[PDB]
């Protein structure tokens, strides 16, 4: 379930409540504005099979149902510390923070690491995704901070240089077109290529081409592995070896 703007709902409760003369609080919302978004969102949940069985009078056995919620909040000037944004951050299991400076720089989708978090944890993710992703999040946050200080003065010590190159290539690798979804096999190949070092010798202006060619290469020849990884998200040494062969052979044999 998607809620397109909970901030506009909060405005609506402001209008009804103030028209009923209820005394306002911070930013003129009622204190009941926490309870509003609380009881709405708290319905979204996953329920155990005993509840499903008791509810449906035993017509469904052993299954477990769920409702997944992606609420949307519009916030002024990127201020994450205003009242209603802070209330909803206090209710969800995490947030995805989109930064206008990244978006204007053409880095899209403009996800900001460090502020964005998923408090549920890696339990949601599949095995191959969890193993290949790992510390990519904090590496990106640290790359951005390092770029902040590197802009200020010149102190380059060769590991800083390679950290910067890696971070810049990863950010160029993360951007993606609108209405262009890609499956877990494609995502896992992309992450594998990024973190097993294969993007060495590859230009930043070539990164998008490198991906287009690689996904076409794996769609053409080693398709059965794609079917396997899309069926079960299993990370084995056998599958790592196959991926290693695919990336070795692509990097050595193909062009982009």
């Amino acid at each position: 379930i998607i809620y397109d703007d909970l901030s506009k709902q909060a405005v609506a409760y402001r209008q009804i409540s103030l028209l009923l003369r209820r005394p306002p609080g911070r930013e003129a919302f009622p204190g009941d504005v926490f309870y509003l978004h609380s009881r709405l969102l708290e319905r979204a949940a996953r329920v155990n099979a005993e509840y499903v069985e008791a509810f449906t009078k035993g017509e469904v056995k052993g299954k477990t149902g769920s409702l997944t919620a992606l609420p949307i909040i519009e916030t002024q000037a990127g201020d994450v510390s205003a009242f209603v944004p802070t209330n909803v951050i206090s209710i969800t299991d995490g947030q995805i923070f989109l930064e206008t400076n990244l978006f204007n720089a053409g880095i899209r989708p403009a996800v900001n690491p460090g502020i964005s978090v998923s408090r549920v944890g890696g339990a949601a993710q599949t095995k191959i995704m969890k193993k290949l992703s790992g510390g990519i999040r904090t590496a990106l946050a640290q790359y951005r901070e390092l770029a902040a200080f590197s802009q200020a003065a010149s102190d380059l010590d060769d590991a800083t240089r390679k950290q910067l190159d890696h971070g810049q290539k990863v950010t160029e690798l993360l951007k993606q077109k609108q209405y262009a979804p890609m499956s877990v096999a494609q995502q896992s190949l992309v992450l594998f290529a990024a973190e097993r070092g294969y993007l060495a010798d590859v230009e930043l202006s070539k990164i998008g081409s490198f991906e287009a060619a690689l996904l076409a290469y794996v769609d053409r020849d080693h398709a059965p592995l794609m079917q396997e990884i899309n069926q079960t998200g299993g990370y084995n040494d056998e599958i790592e070896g196959k991926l290693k062969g695919i990336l070795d052979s692509f990097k050595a044999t193909q062009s982009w």
Partner: protein, 284 residues
């Protein structure tokens, strides 16, 4: 904190930003004038070097203490620094490179020796405790060779007395308008510059009064000239470094204005909301 004093801060930082922009413009222009003064310093030194090559690599190649190579027992550095701040790390980078090499020689048991141009280096190596035997300061943006004569004469006296075996100049190099680098180069004993020609057969100088006397005066003038060239290049490097530093400062000041204004506007809106809540909830 409080929106009236926040607005006061905003005005103050805006005024600061204007003045740093002005300083960037001025630094660029001064860089231009000092790099014109740099080119005029070349011809004197280079024609002097052609004469010195004619005599020193000619068949009349006298063995002069300035011209000969001997084992290092003591070593000296002539060091150029600014009289003025806001130049970024130019002085500190140069001093770090100097500290590295000065450590390397003194581990060989070699006593170090220092002569300082500009007051920043004087203060720095007084804090470090370096062995400073001569200094000149307050030349500002109008250096002159006659002022350099003192420290270089001291170092030269120690050199031909045999006390110092090698003598460097420590200075930044104005490689580009956009980039500069700290350097250490040996000025005594005379480096083995290629400086080869055989046309001297056709025009051999009539040495009045003596050849060796003229050669000594030429070497002394050459060392003086090289020191002046290094000083002028370090001045141009100072102007370029201050230019880039003021550019960075102006940008950071603007980037701080854009945050203080968000704080101010949020406080403005909150104050209006709270006062009007008190008034409306105050009635009846």
């Amino acid at each position: 904190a409080g929106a009236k004093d926040i607005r006061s801060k905003i005005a103050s930082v805006q005024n600061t930003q204007k003045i740093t922009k002005a300083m960037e413009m001025v630094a660029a222009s001064k860089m231009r004038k000092s790099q014109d003064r740099m080119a005029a310093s070349r011809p004197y030194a280079e024609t002097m070097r052609k004469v010195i090559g004619h005599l020193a690599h000619g068949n009349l190649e006298y063995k002069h203490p300035y011209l000969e190579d001997r084992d290092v027992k003591r070593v000296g550095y002539l060091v150029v620094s600014t009289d003025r701040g806001l130049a970024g790390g130019l002085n500190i980078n140069l001093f770090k490179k100097l500290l590295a090499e000065m450590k390397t020689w003194t581990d060989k048991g070699v006593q170090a020796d220092l002569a300082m141009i500009g007051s920043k280096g004087v203060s720095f190596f007084n804090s470090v405790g370096g062995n400073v035997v001569a200094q000149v300061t307050g030349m500002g943006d109008n250096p002159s060779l006659s002022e350099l004569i003192g420290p270089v004469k001291v170092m030269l006296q120690a050199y031909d007395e045999g006390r110092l075996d090698k003598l460097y100049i420590v200075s930044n190099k104005f490689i580009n308008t956009m980039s500069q680098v700290p350097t250490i180069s040996q000025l005594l004993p005379l480096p083995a510059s290629d400086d080869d020609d055989l046309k001297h057969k056709s025009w051999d100088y009539l040495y009045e009064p003596d050849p060796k006397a003229l050669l000594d005066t030429l070497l002394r003038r050459y060392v003086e000239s090289q020191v002046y060239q290094g000083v002028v290049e370090n001045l141009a490097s100072e102007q370029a470094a201050r230019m880039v530093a003021m550019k960075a400062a102006t940008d950071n000041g603007g980037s701080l204005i854009k945050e203080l204004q968000l704080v101010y506007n949020k406080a403005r809106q909150a104050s209006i909301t709270q006062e009007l809540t008190e008034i409306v909830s105050g009635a009846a």
